[PDB]
């Protein structure tokens, strides 16, 4: 009974949360991905002059 | 009052489900429709590290993105200089059954653990020049699955007794015990600001814990089998999991729901490891079919394939500056790709 | 005569494809290897001798006026080396297989170094006998064309023109290696039979096959050489019709030995289960890449 009471309390804690819209989280992820496009040596390969593993 | 507790739990579950459902205006696959594809990603192997005589089970990169540590099932922890392929240290272990290894952010310590329910901390900066056991933590009743350093004095471990622990290396005593899972915890990932961490278990669930106070904040479900790997998005507001059903999934912390599913029809094996690139638009996942797949993180289509390992790709890592990818497999070879 | 280089050409193709397959599969997994793998590689790197011999032979039909005393030797030396190195390496393979079984706990049989020294010893012996083989063959001057028929005959040397050659060849090639093969394989089987393993019925078949292939392919050439020698001594009456049959038999028997030397590298690897699995995996993966259909 105590275990189920703790489970109920945990669910209560989980329920009371402010959630943003999905269309906003996707926009934020797109903004972060686009703002760091020219910083990924795996996405846009760096020339061989600055590659430590040439 | 079993009936009242059951009905309250069902009411809370339905309320949470309805609240999460009412927050999905569109889909991430719909918003990312007009963006340009990444194209074809062709990576070549630049180095091969040899010296392990058994299956490699774990690996970790250094903060400087030059030194790495690898653990295999022959009682040896080997520290490699990736630039020159040289061996810096070879630490013999008291137990040959190791399932995880970690590297301190400062670089002065290394951690190991496995079937023995003990986490061993080794010091790499001894005055005599030899590595010796600095600490041993033995408060777990199940095998250790993962361990990650917070500072030079703190470490978070996950075990097979459905619990996680936060330790104090100076005194060797537990500080916080994160309980709530109903299955063996397989993976563990720290937030970039080291104030939250996600843990995935064999009950097909993931939980978000806060290190300071020590309670579960959010629970994420949707997978069908055990979650073998977990990783944090570089921003820290999302994470990715990989399961035994040949599927990866992307979850958002603020939206509190799934975003995208990465799966194919020619893949039926399991995912052993996942990782993100520095920008965050590439997801690298190692499989049991001896291959590693690179997916576009914004459009759920495969972008590249890494092949060359004889056996299961057991461990995968990306350097902090994102210049190379290290993959370790059961054929006792580590390959660096760029 | 045109057929001779035509038939020898097919042996070249079979040899290069088989040796290339064996070497390619070995190169993929060379981190773990014993003496047997090194010996098989040493057998594989005898195709150069056949290539040199075939290049020297093909110079007859086209560009035919290069031939000197050395060139017939330059053909015969590499041909005999390509023949003998196979025979001498097979005995070393059998010896290593005996050593592994007889001393399973010890670690010195498994070491790669051992094969190396064995791979050297055979390489020495195959040279020395080859040194004899070239010696008898001589440049030839003929009224029509000097080039034709590099022959063993010098001016007045009836006493030693073939009998030393064929006696040493048979004794060193087919009578000592056969005895050593039988001895080592019998010693291996003596300990294998005592075990309870299910594999006992497969090991016996493999041993019988490897001994029987060598015997069956090598024996007819020596039989026909002996028949030739007995013929030229007039111990048996010659109708002179037999001589054509005798020579045509000699040619086909030499061709049979040439084919055996080319084929054996693939046979030794194929009989092993691990090599079969490795080649099945290659045939699955590579063909699954191209002709996949994407």
């Amino acid at each position: 009974i105590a275990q189920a009471r703790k489970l109920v309390e945990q669910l209560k804690m989980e329920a009371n949360i402010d959630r943003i819209k999905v269309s906003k989280a996707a926009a934020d992820l797109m903004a972060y991905c686009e703002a760091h496009a020219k910083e990924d040596p795996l996405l846009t390969p760096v020339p061989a002059s600055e590659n430590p593993f040439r | 009052e079993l009936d009242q507790l059951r009905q309250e739990a069902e009411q809370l579950k339905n309320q949470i489900r309805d609240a999460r459902k009412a927050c999905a205006d569109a889909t991430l696959s719909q918003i990312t429709n007009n963006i340009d594809p990444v194209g074809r990603i062709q990576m070549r192997t630049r180095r091969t590290l040899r010296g392990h005589l058994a299956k490699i089970y774990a690996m970790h990169w250094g903060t400087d993105s030059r030194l790495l540590v690898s653990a295999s099932q022959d009682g040896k922890l080997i520290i490699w200089d990736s630039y020159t392929t040289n061996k810096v240290h070879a630490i013999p272990l008291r137990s040959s059954w190791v399932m995880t290894c970690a590297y301190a952010p400062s670089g002065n310590y290394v951690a190991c653990g496995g079937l023995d329910n003990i986490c061993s901390i080794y010091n790499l900066k001894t005055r005599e020049g030899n590595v010796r056991v600095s600490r041993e933590l033995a408060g777990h009743t199940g095998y250790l699955s993962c361990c990650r350093f917070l500072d030079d004095n703190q470490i978070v471990t996950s075990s097979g007794d459905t619990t996680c622990a936060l330790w104090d290396i100076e005194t060797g005593q537990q500080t916080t015990t994160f309980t709530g899972h109903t299955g063996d915890v397989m993976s563990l990932s720290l937030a970039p600001d080291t104030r939250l961490f996600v843990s995935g278990a064999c009950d097909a669930s993931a939980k978000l814990w806060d290190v300071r106070e020590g309670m579960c904040r959010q629970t994420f479900t949707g997978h069908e089998s055990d979650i073998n790997a977990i990783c944090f998005f570089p921003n820290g507001n999302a994470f990715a999991t990989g399961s035994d059903d040949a599927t990866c999934r992307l979850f958002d912390l603020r939206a509190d729901q799934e975003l995208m599913t990465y799966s194919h029809d020619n893949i039926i094996c399991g995912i052993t490891s996942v990782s993100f690139s520095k920008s965050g638009r590439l997801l690298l996942a190692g499989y049991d079919d001896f291959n590693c797949n690179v997916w576009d993180a914004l459009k759920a289509d495969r972008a590249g394939v890494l092949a060359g390992h004889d056996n299961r790709v057991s461990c995968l890592g990306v350097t902090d500056d994102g210049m190379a990818v290290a993959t370790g497999s059961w054929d006792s070879f580590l390959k660096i790709w760029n | 005569y045109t057929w001779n280089v035509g038939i020898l050409s097919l042996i070249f193709l079979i040899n290069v494809l088989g040796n290339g397959l064996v070497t390619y599969i070995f190169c993929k997994h060379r981190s773990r290897a014993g003496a047997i793998d090194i010996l098989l590689l040493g057998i594989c790197l005898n195709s150069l001798c056949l290539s040199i011999s075939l290049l020297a032979e093909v110079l007859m039909f086209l560009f035919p006026n290069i031939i000197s005393t050395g060139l017939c030797r330059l053909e015969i030396f590499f041909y005999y080396l390509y023949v003998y190195l196979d025979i001498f390496s097979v005995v070393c393979v059998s010896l290593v297989r005996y050593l592994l079984v007889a001393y399973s706990t010890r670690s010195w049989p498994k070491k790669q170094s051992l094969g190396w020294v064995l791979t050297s010893a055979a390489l020495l012996i195959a040279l020395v006998l080859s040194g004899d083989a070239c010696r008898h063959r001589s440049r030839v001057v003929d009224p029509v064309s000097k080039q034709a028929m590099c022959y063993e005959n010098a001016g007045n040397m009836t006493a030693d023109w073939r009998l030393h050659v064929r006696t040493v060849s048979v004794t060193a090639g087919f009578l000592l290696p056969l005895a050593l093969l039988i001895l080592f394989y019998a010693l291996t089987w003596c300990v294998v039979r005592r075990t309870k393993l299910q594999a006992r019925r497969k090991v016996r078949g493999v041993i019988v096959a490897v001994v029987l292939l060598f015997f069956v392919f090598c024996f007819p050439y020596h039989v026909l050489n002996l028949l030739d020698t007995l013929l030229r001594r007039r111990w048996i009456r010659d109708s002179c019709y037999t001589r054509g049959l005798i020579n045509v038999g000699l040619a086909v028997t030499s061709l049979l030995q040439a084919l055996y030397s080319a084929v054996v590298p693939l046979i030794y690897s194929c009989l092993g289960s691990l090599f079969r699995q490795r080649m099945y995996g290659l045939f699955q993966s590579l063909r699954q890449s191209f002709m996949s259909g994407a």
């Binding site: - | 010296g51 005589l53 058994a54 099932q73 022959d74 040896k76 200089d81 020159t84 040289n86 061996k87 810096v88 240290h89 070879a90 013999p92 137990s95 059954w97 399932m99 079937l115 023995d116 329910n117 003990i118 033995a138 009743t141 199940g142 095998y143 097979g160 007794d161 299955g183 063996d184 064999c202 055990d226 | 014993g34 047997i36 290593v96 297989r97 592994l100 079984v101 399973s104 706990t105 670690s107 498994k110 291996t188 300990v191 294998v192 075990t195 309870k196 393993l197 299910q198 594999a199 497969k202 090991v203 493999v206 041993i207 030794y268 690897s269 009989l271 092993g272 289960s273 691990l274 090599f275």
Partner: protein, 232 residues
């Protein structure tokens, strides 16, 4: 090689000396016999480690036992404290020389810990079936020990062989009731043409179990050498 400074070449020398020690230790470790000890409940697993000759060199998971017999080093691994999911770590023991499975003969009428109309022998049969017919154990040999052969000398004189294995008709005798249980434990092998199973009716004395283990593994070593030399 040549374009190396004083500090650079010392690292190469250190790496070469590390690799030399690593291959020395690997060659030393390749000569030991690793055995995995398994059982179902109170089927033994405790006296067997005592019968092992010359036992010679906290944790609550892996239990390691080292010993020597006739110039051979044996390491036995016991997994009794691992109550977690077996399928998540059983692949660690892939490459062990043999699996020693212990079964108590005096369990053909005893119910399980929780009374559920289940005999303690059927659980052993299921565990053996799962371990033997595993993807990670397709060529690993199994040494089967049937321990309590003396306790199977008084209950069998009273109790019949009908509580378990009801399709049995024969005399209540040690020979004809144990040669049947051995057959039922050997019929669960689905790779009878490749995998070998060694059965022994052990006791609490006579110290002859170590000889049986030595004789069983001295064929596994020969079989492995035969597989690595291309003769099979």
């Amino acid at each position: 090689g040549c374009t190396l400074s004083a500090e650079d070449k010392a690292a190469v020398e250190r790496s070469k000396m590390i690799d030399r020690n690593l291959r020395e230790d690997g060659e030393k470790a390749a000569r030991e016999v690793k055995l995995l000890l398994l059982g179902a409940g109170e089927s033994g697993k405790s006296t067997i480690v005592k019968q092992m000759k010359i036992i010679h060199e906290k944790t609550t998971g892996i239990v390691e036992t080292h010993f020597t017999f006739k110039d051979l080093h044996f390491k036995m691994f016991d997994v009794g404290g691992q109550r977690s999911e077996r399928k998540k770590w059983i692949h660690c023991f892939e490459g062990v020389t043999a699996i020693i499975f212990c079964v108590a003969l005096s369990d053909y009428d005893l119910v399980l810990a929780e009374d559920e109309e289940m005999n303690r022998m059927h659980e052993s049969m299921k565990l053996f079936d799962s371990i033997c017919n595993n993807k990670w154990f397709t060529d690993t040999s199994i040494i089967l020990f049937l321990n309590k052969k003396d306790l199977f000398e008084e209950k069998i004189k009273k109790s019949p062989l009908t509580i378990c294995y009801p399709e049995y008709a024969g005399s209540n005798t040690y020979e004809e009731a144990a040669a049947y249980i051995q057959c039922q434990f050997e019929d669960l092998n689905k790779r009878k043409d490749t995998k070998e199973i060694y059965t022994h009716f052990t006791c609490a004395t006579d110290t002859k179990n170590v000889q049986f283990v030595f004789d069983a593994v001295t064929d596994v070593i020969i079989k492995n050498n035969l597989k690595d030399c291309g003769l099979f």
